[PDB]
Scaffold this active site. Sequence first.
Site, PDB file in Angstrom:
ATOM      1  CG  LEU G  41     -10.252   1.463  -7.174  1.00 59.24           C
ATOM      2  CD1 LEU G  41      -9.988   1.777  -8.663  1.00 59.24           C
ATOM      3  CD2 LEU G  41     -11.624   1.446  -6.719  1.00 59.24           C
ATOM      4  CG  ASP G  42      -4.797  -2.130  -4.796  1.00 62.18           C
ATOM      5  OD1 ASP G  42      -5.398  -2.132  -3.660  1.00 62.18           O
ATOM      6  OD2 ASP G  42      -4.400  -3.080  -5.542  1.00 62.18           O
ATOM      7  CB  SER G  43      -2.808   3.730  -4.166  1.00 65.45           C
ATOM      8  OG  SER G  43      -1.812   3.229  -4.225  1.00 65.45           O
ATOM      9  CD  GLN G  46      -6.857   7.769  -6.437  1.00 70.18           C
ATOM     10  OE1 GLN G  46      -7.270   8.883  -6.858  1.00 70.18           O
ATOM     11  NE2 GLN G  46      -5.708   7.920  -6.010  1.00 70.18           N
TER      12      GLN G  46
END
Lengths: 176, 56, 60, 459, 157, 59, 87, 55, 171, 128, 68, 119
Positions: G41-43, G46
């Site tokens: 999953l991406d930043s 996040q």
Amino acid sequence: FLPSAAYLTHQQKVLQLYKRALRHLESRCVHRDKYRYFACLLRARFDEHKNEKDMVKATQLLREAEKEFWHGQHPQPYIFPESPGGTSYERYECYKVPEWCLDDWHPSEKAMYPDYFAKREQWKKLRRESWEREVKQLQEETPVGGPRTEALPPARKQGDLPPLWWHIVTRPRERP
Amino acid sequence: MNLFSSLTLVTLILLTMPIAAINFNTHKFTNYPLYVKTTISCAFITSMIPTMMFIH
Amino acid sequence: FGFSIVLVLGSTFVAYLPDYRMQEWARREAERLVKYREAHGLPLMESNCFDPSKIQLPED
Amino acid sequence: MLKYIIPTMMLMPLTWLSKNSMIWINTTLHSLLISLTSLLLLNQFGDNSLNFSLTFFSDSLSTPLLILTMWLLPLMLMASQHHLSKENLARKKLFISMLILLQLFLIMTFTATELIFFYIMFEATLVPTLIIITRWGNQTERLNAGLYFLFYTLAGSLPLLVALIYIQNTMGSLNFLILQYWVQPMPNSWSNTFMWLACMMAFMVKMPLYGLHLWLPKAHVEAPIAGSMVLAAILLKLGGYGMMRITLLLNPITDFMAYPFIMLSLWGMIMTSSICLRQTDLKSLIAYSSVSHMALVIVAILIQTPWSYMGATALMIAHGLTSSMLFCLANSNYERVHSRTMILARGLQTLLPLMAAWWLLASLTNLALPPSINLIGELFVVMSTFSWSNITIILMGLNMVITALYSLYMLITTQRGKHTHHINNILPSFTRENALMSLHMLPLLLLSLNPKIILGPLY
Amino acid sequence: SHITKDMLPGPYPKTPEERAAAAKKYNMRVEDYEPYPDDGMGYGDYPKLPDRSQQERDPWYDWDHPDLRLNWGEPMHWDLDMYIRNRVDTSPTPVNWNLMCKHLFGFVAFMLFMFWVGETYPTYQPVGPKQYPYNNLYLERGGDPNKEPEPVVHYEI
Amino acid sequence: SIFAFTHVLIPVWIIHYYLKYHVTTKPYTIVEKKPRIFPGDTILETGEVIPPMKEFPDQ
Amino acid sequence: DAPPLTLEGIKDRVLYVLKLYDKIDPEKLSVNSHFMKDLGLDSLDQVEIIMAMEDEFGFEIPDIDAEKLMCPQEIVDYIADKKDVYE
Amino acid sequence: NINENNPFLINSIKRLLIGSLFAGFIISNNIPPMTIPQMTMPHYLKMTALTVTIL
Amino acid sequence: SWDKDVYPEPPRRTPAPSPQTSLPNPITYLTKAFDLLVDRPVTLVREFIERQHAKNKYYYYHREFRRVPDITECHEKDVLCMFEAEMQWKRDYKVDQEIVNIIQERLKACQQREGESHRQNCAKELQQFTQVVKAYQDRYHDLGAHYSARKCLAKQKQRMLAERKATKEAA
Amino acid sequence: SFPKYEPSRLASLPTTLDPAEYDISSETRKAQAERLAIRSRLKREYQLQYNDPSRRGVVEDPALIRWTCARSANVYPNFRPNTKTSLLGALFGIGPLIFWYYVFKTDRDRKEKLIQEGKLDRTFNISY
Amino acid sequence: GKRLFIIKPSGFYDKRFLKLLRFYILLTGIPVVIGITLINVFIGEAELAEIPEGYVPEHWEYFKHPIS
Amino acid sequence: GAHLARRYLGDASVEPEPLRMPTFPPDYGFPERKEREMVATQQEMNDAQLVLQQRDYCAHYLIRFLKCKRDSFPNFLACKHEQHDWDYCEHLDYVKRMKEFERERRLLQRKKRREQREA
């Protein structure tokens, strides 16, 4: 303005804009579920042009996003009552007496607390024991004449504690 | 009336004892909140009477 | 010799002493004088404290 | 009075032929015995002043200042170690004997019949404090401090001598009754204006007024605690008492010629309350506080109401007590940390847990907490000056607002909020400093109980 | 202790020497050092800073003096005592400043003008005078027990 | 119980002593604002009535 | 006013409110799981996760930390820094 | 952590709600009227207070 | 005790209340119990202390001074007449201040007794207060701080000179 | 959308619309990196003079002493009396003083002339 | 095992100074207050008489309180 | 009410100027219309220490109400008939003030418009 680097990056600036927009939209929008809807709308509006290869277009739309967010902020954001600026700002600072005190007591009170002060004596011996040689050797050892950073390496060599530890270990419990 | 002035001045002077008490205490009496509460309650229940005489 | 013989003894000394600036003397003197002048019919505090017959005005 | 003078002379060789580790107890004990002896003075009554034969007398104005002085001496004599308690025996005896001789000329100056005797003992009061603050000033500009001190006070106080010899050789001798009982009103010449300017300007130097106020602050911040407390309390209120003596003459001309001094005093009171709101160097804020209160005193002296004189003497004695205490607290803080500045050593609510109560009580008697003597003085001065003029009350209350502001800013700046946690050397409070605190604030509150003593001759 | 050349008399000239000395002495970058300059106002050669610095410096950097905003080596701008929190909030205001004062002064002027229009124009119900019987309550005013008899009466309506 | 005993008997006794004898020394001291009498009342001290209030009419 | 917080219980609470979030499984998820590498999953998501932890526990984290948590164990370590989770 | 197992809380809140129910009427009854009560108000003037609060 | 001839206290006026209730009367039993609990032991202790006082006797005497002849018969410089005259005048000044204080206390008492009808039965005492304060404002006011006796005499001479000029221009 | 935030000497300029952060050059990167190096060396020297168990007293910051010596005793040297400083001193020092002295002249002239006419309210005006 | 250890600054010197101050004002405050109570409860203050014809008192015998 | 709108919009004449209300000569069209009983016992009005701006008409109801409230102190709610009678008397006094207001208002209106528009 950060201990590790000189600047953050472009990505960190877009990232903090996301976080602050999400927080200010929490403060703007009650009932939390229409808020969840509008937060998904904000996530989609950031998903408009994530796929830009250009850089001046990225920083230009970031500047315009800052303009749009400053037009749509809220005067009293929901800053948490733990953070400075909120309702705490070290709320219980009345009893945050540091530990360079508590040794300036009369030996009657030190006779009232024998075991804790004996263990404080062994902690003080642990501080004094390898203070001089190993910490001066590691701090004169690793950097170049320009330090150029504000961190410090741990005691990875052989033995004892990582250097400059005392006032970070010894601190108030933050609920005294 | 002597009762009127007497009870008003003792409502004033019931608000004098705890301050001088824990100025001259030197022994940490842990029921001092209970002490302050019961002397304020006694001060009120003495203060209701001269008002009752006043409206009377 | 700084508190136990100085402070409380000075408190009892300055608490009462003779009539400073003849104060209560003036109280009782004024009470007797007001009763005197009420008894003798004349108004209390006769104005012109110096005698108006005892004057030699510079004429013009 | 000579029974209140000669044991101070006999107190001088006490310090000399007292041996080592023994001078301290003997000096403190016998100066407190002198404090009882001077507490036995108060007998004055009704019609006249109290004569202590031909050389001496006392009004009911010199009496509270004299009892204040001899009470302030043992406080100072216990205050003045831990910066010279490790010095030599002979120099220590010299220091203590110089303080005793200084007290002797203070009592000589307060108990004067003739103004020539008053002037000789005035600059005799001047000379030892010079030596004390110059020798133990403990900063690199104490030379300049003592130099400006002596040159301002002599160069202003000098035409007073010529004017007093003139009043001596034109209108008989200089008893205060015979300066009184005989003084004709001297009309508006220009020579009368110059003589009035000489006498009043000499004591204007000693107050100080606003135009000559930089005399003070170097001679406080670059001076030890003994010379500081003697200087502030007894020298400034001594100049005030001197003007209270000499203002009996020259009444028909002070109305026409006393407008600008009121003016410089008022505007300097405002600007001095403004100047001590922002400074560092914690010791100096109390010095400019003293300049503000003495400008208020000078407004009160140069208007000539009995209300104004009662408020004047109350403000004198109460501000002497308050400023001497607050200087002792700043000394305690500097003995804790050797900085003298303000923003550095914050915190001190956690540590020194009852020293905060003394900072609080000193700052609230500096705030004019209303049963105290300080508000009695300030209040009757405000009443008399509103009787003098209908518009000056804005300046008085503006002084009041800014005075509360800088005093309580001093309270919540240095002793409120956060230890900087690099200090890590200060020890908790000694019994000596708290003993000096209880020496300070018990007489102030006892005078707040019974204040019919300290009000002036126009009671 | 303290070096004699860690005082700072004299102004900025010349541009190599005193600028290099101020870079060495004030612990700053060379071009970040700027004197005011000396227009005759004293000031030594004490540096110019970004002047706000206290509602700035966001407190999550966790420097060494949290309520003082020090860093033990910062040059400490000349107006420091006017800047610490408890004195002046140098925050970015969320709206403006001149637009704020125009709104506020317009509001105060509008309310005081409606007060003035009220002060010239009173309100009153259909209501007559209160009939004080004994000569507008004579003999209980501030005098006249026998001096002026003033006959005035009401009529039953 | 002993708290109530001391704090409703001791200052009451001290102040009630203080409000008889020192107030009967000092003359111009605690003073009342007068009890109001009515036309339908009497005077307790000597003993006589104020004559009653007059006719009512047009209720 | 402070209920007794222990390490393993507050770890279970963090992993529980992660498990309540939709687009990651309860299946291949443990304490030594990553937020960029294995879950992928991406930043942005996040930081949505970091906002969920902040809104549960009631205190923010500084942006000097915001890049470099990436696993639940170091989240537990920073919350143990904040609350001093012991007896 | 919502807890009110407390005699202090229920006593204080209890006694001040008892005060906010009775003490206004107890004060408003037994005072000597030192003024003239108006008591003669028109239509739509006594009603407009509660009208404005309801709207 | 004191003199009621010099301190006017008007005579008592107390009615007898009339219930017209049968609850009845909590404060009546309260003041009876208060008398039974407090009014008797204070009397007993005072009687004990009065015996212990009046077993022996002391005396204070009202200190009285004679009358100095004049300041008007005193000479130019010649001090030892003026000292007597000025201290006698200063004692008259103190006792005149206390006259003003006692008349002001009479005014306070007339205010507090008469109820809300302030202007009933106080016009004569207000009138004598204004009379004595008119005399005081005329005689002792505008001299300032350094009164000895001579400034009062100068004020007196200048004021009767002004009165002489006013009545001569009126004639 | 927004009026682009005019600044003042009170309204601080925030970190978002600088806009000069976005003109990234090697000069500004070198300046920020050397600024980080300066604060790094200062914090390292502080932590070496801060954490020692034998060091009793205060840290003895020379920057604070430098600020105090600049603020207290470095005022009068250096100085030159110019036209601007003289005009500002005479505008702030004698100006408001002669203002309040003129208005005290005015109020005292009014009071003197009124009580010389005698039309004052001194039926009782005792406490002067 | 529930409680924590709080870090108080110091209590010893504070309570030492206050115990010494209350004892050293109590040591001759209470005997003097007891003594002045015994004086004005036993010895009598003064009585209200005046000066007879041709009889002189001293400069005392003029005052209310006997210790004065 | 609408009288306020009439005084702020129309002529200033027929709306009478407030608190300068005795304008026209009394007993104008009255003749012999007055008794003014005033049986409120002025000396007893002093003896009962009332308030100023209460030494007026309908005072005897206040006297009797204060008498019964003095008499019945444990009766916390008994005295209400005399209270309502005093309310009734001041209600009729407000009626008299309203009638006097429109007396002066209608005399102003009818007579002044009559003269100034048939002169």
